[PDB]
Write a protein that holds these residues in place. Structure first.
Motif, short mmCIF file in Angstrom:
data_model
loop_
_atom_site.label_atom_id
_atom_site.label_comp_id
_atom_site.label_asym_id
_atom_site.label_seq_id
_atom_site.Cartn_x
_atom_site.Cartn_y
_atom_site.Cartn_z
N UNK A 159 0.77 -1.28 0.09
CA UNK A 159 0.37 -0.08 0.03
C UNK A 159 1.20 1.36 -0.30
N UNK A 160 2.01 0.92 0.06
CA UNK A 160 3.48 2.12 0.07
C UNK A 160 3.31 2.83 -1.50
N UNK A 161 3.66 2.24 -2.49
CA UNK A 161 3.41 3.22 -4.29
C UNK A 161 4.33 4.14 -3.77
N UNK A 162 5.41 4.26 -3.54
CA UNK A 162 6.64 4.60 -3.25
C UNK A 162 8.13 3.89 -2.90
N UNK A 163 8.65 3.85 -4.49
CA UNK A 163 9.53 2.03 -4.86
C UNK A 163 9.12 1.14 -5.22
N UNK A 164 9.89 0.42 -4.67
CA UNK A 164 9.13 -0.89 -5.48
C UNK A 164 8.12 -1.33 -4.35
N UNK A 165 7.87 -3.09 -4.28
CA UNK A 165 7.59 -3.43 -3.38
C UNK A 165 7.75 -4.93 -2.56
N UNK A 166 9.23 -5.19 -3.85
CA UNK A 166 9.98 -6.00 -2.53
C UNK A 166 10.94 -5.43 -1.71
N UNK A 167 11.51 -4.19 -2.24
CA UNK A 167 12.31 -3.47 -1.71
C UNK A 167 11.57 -2.71 0.12
N UNK A 168 10.19 -2.39 -0.12
CA UNK A 168 9.32 -1.86 0.45
C UNK A 168 8.92 -2.74 1.87
N UNK A 169 8.78 -4.30 1.53
CA UNK A 169 8.07 -5.41 2.27
C UNK A 169 9.55 -5.53 2.63
N UNK A 170 10.97 -6.35 2.24
CA UNK A 170 12.64 -6.71 2.95
C UNK A 170 12.91 -5.35 4.20
N UNK A 171 12.56 -3.91 3.82
CA UNK A 171 12.65 -3.14 4.71
C UNK A 171 11.69 -2.89 6.03
N UNK B 120 18.67 0.99 2.68
CA UNK B 120 18.41 0.38 1.11
C UNK B 120 19.32 -1.54 1.26
N UNK B 121 18.81 -1.51 0.23
CA UNK B 121 19.30 -3.05 -0.24
C UNK B 121 20.76 -3.41 -0.41
N UNK B 122 21.25 -2.32 -1.40
CA UNK B 122 22.40 -2.56 -0.66
C UNK B 122 23.51 -2.97 0.92
N UNK B 123 22.52 -2.50 1.45
CA UNK B 123 22.96 -2.59 2.87
C UNK B 123 22.33 -3.99 3.61
N UNK B 124 21.92 -4.51 3.05
CA UNK B 124 20.51 -5.34 2.88
C UNK B 124 20.71 -6.52 2.60
N UNK B 125 21.53 -7.43 2.26
CA UNK B 125 21.24 -8.50 1.97
C UNK B 125 21.03 -8.87 0.51
N UNK B 126 22.13 -8.61 -0.30
CA UNK B 126 21.70 -8.34 -1.74
C UNK B 126 21.93 -9.29 -2.70
N UNK B 127 22.12 -10.97 -2.16
CA UNK B 127 22.16 -11.91 -2.03
C UNK B 127 20.39 -12.67 -2.47
N UNK B 128 19.74 -12.61 -2.13
CA UNK B 128 18.59 -13.98 -1.61
C UNK B 128 17.47 -13.20 -3.00
#
Lengths: 82, 201, 89, 68
Positions: free
Chosen positions: B76-88, B181-189
């Motif tokens: 429900x954010x719609x500011x950015x993507x939807x997987x990034x906002x999830x993992x954040x 940010x994703x670079x700072x957070x498991x850019x692996x899975x």
RNA sequence: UGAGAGUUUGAUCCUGGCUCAGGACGAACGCUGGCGGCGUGCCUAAUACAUGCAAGUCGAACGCUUCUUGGAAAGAGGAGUGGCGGACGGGUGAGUAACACGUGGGUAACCUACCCAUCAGAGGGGGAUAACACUUGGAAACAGGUGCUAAUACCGCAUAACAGUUUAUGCCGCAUGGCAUAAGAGUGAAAGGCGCUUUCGGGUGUCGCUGAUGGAUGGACCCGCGGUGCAUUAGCUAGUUGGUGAGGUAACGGCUCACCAAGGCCACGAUGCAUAGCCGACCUGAGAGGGUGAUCGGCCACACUGGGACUGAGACACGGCCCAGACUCCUACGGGAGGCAGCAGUAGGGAAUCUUCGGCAAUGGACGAAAGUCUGACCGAGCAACGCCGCGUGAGUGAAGAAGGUUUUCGGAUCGUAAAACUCUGUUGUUAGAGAAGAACAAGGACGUUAGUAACUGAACGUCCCCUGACGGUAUCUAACCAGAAAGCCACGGCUAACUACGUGCCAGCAGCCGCGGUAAUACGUAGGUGGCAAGCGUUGUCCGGAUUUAUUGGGCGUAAAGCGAGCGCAGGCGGUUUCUUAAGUCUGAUGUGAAAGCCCCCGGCUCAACCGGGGAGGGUCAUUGG
């Protein structure tokens, strides 16, 4: 009946019915007594017109006919004699 | 329920560590059971999306209903993507805050510390681990009884302190500076396989 | 018999009330004419919000408050204004 | 049936205890063995009894959990 | 915000059906279960109902009577006359295809107790009656007769027309007509109680009483448009359609009468038959749509089945009356009594659905001047994983992999850092201390201000003392002790994530669709292992999706299903070029309305979340008026 207050309403309304019907019949006969004398062409014709008008008026203050019924009645009688 | 099993079979089945790089996949990097060392043929593209989802679900030790509601909320954010906002959003739960700050080695230990009532946000105690920690809220260590054996020792050995976490090791206060940010957070899975997994749910 | 009375809107043991003007035959939580303010029995100095320009208009048309509504309408100084408009002109 | 229309019904599992004039319960489910059968009886729900070896899917077949 | 797969063949492409992968529910049942929070719980027989409770109140309207303290004043009981309430609140969905409901309008055809405002009255008489006392017939329910008595009970006489109606005048409107002012004719009411001043004072505060006018609130009637199947249902109407008059109603009207005429409705679906309470809303879908009308709010209809009226401001009346009918019950045989679709509860029907609980402390309702009395509305408690949400059944370190189980080519592998061992923790559990908010008030005392007064009592609000909790010693908080009490269900051949042993031998059995089983079965039954979810997990039933498989969005007819054997033509559908005009469709602005609660957006409170509150948007095929 079951409730104590329902038992009193029975006699109270029976008594109200008795006197209400008495007085309505009074009014009806006054009116008819005027009509049968205007249909004959008799002397003593304005006095019983007056009496019938008074009869209707008194029935309206006793809560027997509404108030518009009384206006209607007095109109009808007025158009017959005076 | 949460989970109590051997916790290390779990990493051997996802092919990812899950425990701060401390090696569960040191010997025998294959799956459990009889047919472990003798692998077999290919895996579908359903197995791949399922395996990514399970990796993320077992990272932070939550159940399937709660995982799915968090995912529906991040949409429900719609500011950015939807997987990034999830993992954040996943990172802002009070258990990860205790893990990252450094008051506990594992996430199971951090969960038991926040469950048994040993930590406080803004002074007031908070007991439930799925709490949502916002940006700029100094979470503390119950200045009543902060003289416990394991908290003390696990503050010393700092294996990982991030670039979004602030902390002071005397009053024992920490907080998020800002959102990671994703670079700072498991850019692996992933965050795209997981999004596709919920398209046909 | 228009009234000005309270209407319960809590959950089970945390009640809340809307101040409402209703015909007295209506159910407590049923139909009403319009809503006039709000009232909160918790929140130690209890919270009242109300418009007080419709209360003065309904009062002058013959509406009547309940006992609690009169207490919280005098703590707001609405009954004094009714007093100063009616029996002063 | 209670509404007085007649149907045949399969009784599953290994071994039962059903005799003439015993009262039973039916659920939906059609067997692909022969025509005219469209229902299953449910084991362990009335006069019918659960099967007495099962160890693996006892929630069907109406077997209780054994200490073994 | 539009995901697909298996299955017709020896192999293929197309057509085509069937099946599966997602959701949800007032659910039921099989195996299995530790807690809190908030909700939900006869969908079937509108079946029949033991037992208790669900509607009364007023002594400041009136006469009596019994006590506790022969003349005594208070307190507490009893029935009676009289007022008001019983048309609300609460239940159910049987009837109903129609102004019943939704939305938008009209009434110059209308009524309205209690409540607020304004103007004007409130005079003077009469005859009774219950109660009570005595008495008759009664099995009873109950009926009569005699004698005395009160009122705010009842009835006439006065006075009042501001009401209606008719005439003239002026202004006006959408026919009928509306408003205001002047006259004329006949007529119509009323009741006291409690206080203050009390020189006879004869004055006065307050609550009631009568007539007229406004407001508010509640109801009534008429109209446009909108929501179901069948044409293997085409004709239906005789008070029927219109006129004249008369009666009748709050009110217009065939509403009902007498007369006169021959009209009315239908292919744009009349009539009949079947089914159904309607809506806000709810589930599903990318949308257009499709399927439901349970909890909560609004409107309607019914009250053992069917007729009727009476009282009343309001009923053709949900715990009222009268008659008929079926059923049940008591009787001395002459006769009498009753209606859970109110809350609990019972028998019965069913796959299936709860306690014969506490309290008026809070919010609302009836009566009373008030204290108060009544309230199964309602606020709380009990039962049930029925649902949604939250937290547990430990945490950290721990090896050449202890014993055991399964397998093995007999070397080993896997269950497995999992146990052990060491150090910690107490959400929960237990025991012990403390401990709430929900409460604001009515009444009662003093004190002030204003409008009335000859004046005080009182009226209307302000300021202060004083007074009340069913839940309940509930939530919650503090101290000590202990890893000790707390994990199961389904699946593992392909769809579709997860494999090896042994037993059995087209048997016993399995299946949603393909299809398995005849000696080495990853498809049957067990064991070891593994996968999905988890206080739940599977199964059956019902609905939407996938289904472009009724295609407006969004398909087709040479051979797959599908051009009438051909013409002629009434109704209908669609139509060449152009100038001026109109404004029905079309486009657009402003105003009114589309309740509350819901979905959604922002903000805030319960330790979080479910949940609760405040402010908004949205939703019409809508109406009016201007381009």
């Amino acid at each position: 009946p079951n409730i104590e207050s329902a038992i009193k309403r029975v006699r109270t309304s029976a008594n109200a019915n008795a006197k209400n019907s008495s007085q309505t019949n009074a009014m009806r006969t006054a009116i008819k007594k005027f009509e049968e004398a205007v249909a004959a062409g008799a002397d003593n014709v304005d006095a019983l017109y007056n009496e019938a008008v008074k009869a209707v008026d008194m029935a309206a203050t006793k809560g027997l006919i509404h108030k518009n019924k009384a206006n209607r009645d007095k109109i009808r009688l007025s158009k017959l004699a005076k | 329920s949460r989970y109590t099993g051997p916790s290390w079979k779990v990493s051997r089945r996802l092919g990812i560590s899950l425990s701060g790089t401390g090696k569960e996949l040191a010997r025998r990097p294959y799956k459990p059971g009889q047919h472990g060392p003798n692998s077999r043929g290919k895996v579908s593209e359903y197995g791949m999306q399922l395996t990514e989802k399970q990796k993320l679900r077992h990272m932070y030790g939550m159940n399937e209903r709660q995982f799915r509601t968090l995912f529906i909320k991040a949409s429900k954010i719609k500011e950015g993507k939807h997987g990034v906002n999830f993992m954040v959003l996943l990172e802002q739960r009070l258990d990860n805050v205790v893990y990252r700050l450094g008051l506990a080695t594992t996430r199971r230990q951090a969960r038991q510390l926040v469950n048994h009532g040993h930590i406080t946000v803004d002074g007031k105690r908070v007991d439930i681990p799925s709490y949502h920690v916002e940006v700029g809220q100094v979470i503390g260590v119950r200045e009543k009884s902060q003289n416990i054996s394991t908290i003390k020792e696990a503050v010393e050995a700092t294996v990982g302190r991030p670039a979004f976490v602030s902390f002071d090791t005397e009053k024992l206060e920490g907080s998020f500076t800002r959102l990671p940010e994703r670079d700072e957070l498991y850019p692996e899975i992933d965050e795209a396989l997981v999004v596709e997994y919920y398209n046909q749910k | 018999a228009v009234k000005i009375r309270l209407k319960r809107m809590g959950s089970k043991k945390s009640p809340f009330y809307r101040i409402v003007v209703a015909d007295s035959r209506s159910p407590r939580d049923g139909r009403f004419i319009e809503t006039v303010g709000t009232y909160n029995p918790l929140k130690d100095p209890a919270e009242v919000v109300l418009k007080e320009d419709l209360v003065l208009d309904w009062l002058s048309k013959g509406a009547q408050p309940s006992d609690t509504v009169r207490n919280i309408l005098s703590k707001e100084g609405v009954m004094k204004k009714h007093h100063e408009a009616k029996n002063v002109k | 049936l209670s509404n007085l229309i007649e149907v045949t019904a399969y009784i599953p599992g290994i071994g039962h205890n059903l005799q003439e004039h015993s009262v039973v319960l039916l659920r939906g489910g059609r067997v692909k063995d022969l025509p005219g059968v469209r229902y299953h009886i449910v084991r362990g729900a009335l006069d019918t009894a659960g099967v007495n070896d099962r160890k693996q899917s006892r929630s069907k077949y109406g077997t209780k959990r054994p200490k073994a």
